């Protein structure tokens, strides 16, 4: 597919909306050393002194995991600090943002897409997280009382609540839909959305007249894609596979941990005091040491699994953060990085422990090859196009942009003269229309 006298240019263009889901954080947890090792024991100073080192190491690892998760979610969801109020209007030049813009009427202050994501992503009722949430009672004074039941197992609340994440997402949506985002600082000057989209088309290499002559078509395509994405998310269960899989993995890890907690292993009973009460001290020592070793091994397996999951989630959160930095806050020059085609805009939305990007993609289609000539000779003087290339439709010659087919007649304003026709190789004989000639001839 190579030629020395032909050029291939697109003829038609399409606008698509793609959804990219990326997890950003998990459910933080911690274990109490003074209660996991000790348990329901009247005196456990010697046991604590014997077995506190590994418990402290595991607690430090859990603290590191929690701080890494909090740092990741803060980095991915607090890139911009400046904010301003929401736009009351929902339509901007025919584009419908009802599913994206939050609805102030609903008390949840969320979007229909966000509401669907929250409803379709839940947690198992028969889980440790749900029981801990029910027993917490929305008070920090009762944390220890319920932690005694779970032997120090606690769920650390996230640093940023759902309301803060929703507010940040709404502010980002406002800053993207209206005005714009500069490379740093904060929001840019106010500008109508069609003009911003025309600027984006100019950035990707398409003249704004294409948008202005096809505003209705692109608006209809965007509305259809927005309407279809909700149905695709609601119907297809595999769309939200990543977040649901992560939640289920965390839930099953916690469930197997708490199940192994109640296991008696190889002792008379799980009660530490009963072993020493019903047995002599020398035998009770090993009968408790075996239980301690089993619990420590189970906790080590849980913490190493949590470390692996935390590393994976950290990688995913870094990918999400760099995607937001490159595509959400500004136009991205990379091809197929945000979608499949040319990235135009991104509309982030929040989901339980995740962020969804609605990438807008420009896709050329109907590529056609036409004969091209480097220069045109009219009156023994080479003419070169100011911005574009010469394309022949088979019988006539026109000047067209590289990235689109816009046949325009040859005029003295679209071309400039330089040199003679003999020096240039590939000269083609054609007539260059001068608009002054008919006006001067009309006088006669």
């Amino acid at each position: 597919a190579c030629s020395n006298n032909s050029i291939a240019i697109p003829t038609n263009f399409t606008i698509s909306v793609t959804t990219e889901i990326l997890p950003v954080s998990m459910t933080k947890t911690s274990v109490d050393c003074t209660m996991y090792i000790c348990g329901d024991s009247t005196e456990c100073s010697n046991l604590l002194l014997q077995y506190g080192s590994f418990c402290t190491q595991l607690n430090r690892a859990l603290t590191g995991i929690a701080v890494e998760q909090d740092k990741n979610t803060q980095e991915v969801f607090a890139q911009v600090k400046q904010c301003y109020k929401t736009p009351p209007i929902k339509d901007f030049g025919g584009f419908n943002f009802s599913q994206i813009l939050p609805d102030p009427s609903k008390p949840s202050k969320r979007s229909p897409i966000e509401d669907l994501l929250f409803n379709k992503v839940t947690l198992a009722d028969a889980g440790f997280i749900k029981q801990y949430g029910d027993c917490l009672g929305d008070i920090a004074a009762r944390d220890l009382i319920c932690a005694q039941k779970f032997n120090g197992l606690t769920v650390l609340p996230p640093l940023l609540t759902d309301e803060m994440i929703a507010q940040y997402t709404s502010c980002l949506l406002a800053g993207t839909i209206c005005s714009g985002w500069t490379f740093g600082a904060g929001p840019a000057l106010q500008i109508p959305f069609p003009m911003q989209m025309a600027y984006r088309f100019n950035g990707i290499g398409v003249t704004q007249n294409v948008l202005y002559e096809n505003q209705k078509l692109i608006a209809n395509q965007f509305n259809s894609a927005i309407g279809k994405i909700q149905d695709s998310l609601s119907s297809t269960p595999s769309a939200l596979g990543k977040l649901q899989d992560v939640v289920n993995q965390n839930a099953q890890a916690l469930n197997t941990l708490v199940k192994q907690l109640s296991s008696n292993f190889g002792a008379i009973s799980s009660v530490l005091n009963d072993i020493l009460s019903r047995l002599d001290k020398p035998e009770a020592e090993v009968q408790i040491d075996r239980l301690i070793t089993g619990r420590l091994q189970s906790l080590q397996t849980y913490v190493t699994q949590q470390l692996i999951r935390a590393a994976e989630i950290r990688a995913s959160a870094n990918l999400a953060a760099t995607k937001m930095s490159e595509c959400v806050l500004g136009q991205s020059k990379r091809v197929d990085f945000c979608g499949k085609g040319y990235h135009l805009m991104s509309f982030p939305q929040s989901a339980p422990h995740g962020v969804v990007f609605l990438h807008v993609t420009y896709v050329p289609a109907q590529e056609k090859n036409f004969t091209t000539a480097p220069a045109i000779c009219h009156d023994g003087k080479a003419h070169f196009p100011r911005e574009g290339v010469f394309v022949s439709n088979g019988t006539h010659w026109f000047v067209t942009q590289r990235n689109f087919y816009e046949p325009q007649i040859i005029t003295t304003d679209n071309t400039f003269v330089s040199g003679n026709c003999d020096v240039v190789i590939g000269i083609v004989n054609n007539t260059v229309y001068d608009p002054l000639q008919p006006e001067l001839d009309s006088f006669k």
């Epitope: 274990v31 109490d32 050393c33 003074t34 024991s41 005196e43 603290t63 701080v67 220890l144 650390l156």
Partner: antibody, heavy 125, light 106 residues
Framework: QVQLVQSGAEVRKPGASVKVSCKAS????????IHWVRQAPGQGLEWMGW????????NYAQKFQGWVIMTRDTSISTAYMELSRLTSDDTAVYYC????????????????????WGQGTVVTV | IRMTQSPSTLSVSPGERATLSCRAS??????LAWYQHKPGQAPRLLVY???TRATGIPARFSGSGSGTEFTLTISSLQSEDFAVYYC???????????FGPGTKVD
Amino acid sequence: QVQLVQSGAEVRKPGASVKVSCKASGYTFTGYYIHWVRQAPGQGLEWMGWINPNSGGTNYAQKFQGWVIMTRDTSISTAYMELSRLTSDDTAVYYCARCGARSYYYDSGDYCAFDIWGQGTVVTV
Amino acid sequence: IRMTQSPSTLSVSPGERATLSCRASQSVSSYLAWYQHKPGQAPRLLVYGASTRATGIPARFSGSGSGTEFTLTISSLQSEDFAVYYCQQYNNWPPPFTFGPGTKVD
């Protein structure tokens, strides 16, 4: 409303038992670790140990191991510290404090700093 | 673990910023707290953690530092700020909770 009340100053002969009672008011007695500290005249502060009012677990330091017995009474919400083998070097002021000020984020229940203290009981040999 | 404070005493006029340094033999991370003990009153918590202040503590008190070295600063010395300052470490390892030697102010 939260307050910690300690017993008054008491004097005991050497090689005797001293019972110091610490009472808590304004909050639920269970669910918060209670620690004891000793301030010697002209010296620093030494952490004697701690007791869990919920279960009853007592952990003491190596120096104070055996000499100190900590008991709890959730019915009236009182922590009793009983000393044994009163030595002439035990003359100090004993304070009971509640471990709190916990960072609800990034931290677990074990790591805490005392926020409310008692009044202080002075013992003389 | 050993905790050492500096200096032993200060002579600061009222309404003047003052600072006190504290250090440990090994790394302590953010498990350090500052306590103010009056001669006739029980010690009270002023700053817990690296720089977080306790409830009811005025903004004049502040804390800084990390690793093994921390510092406590006061914007203006007043009559209520005439007590002894102690450093308390609540790190689980080692199990003992070593206190600070103490520092007087004037």
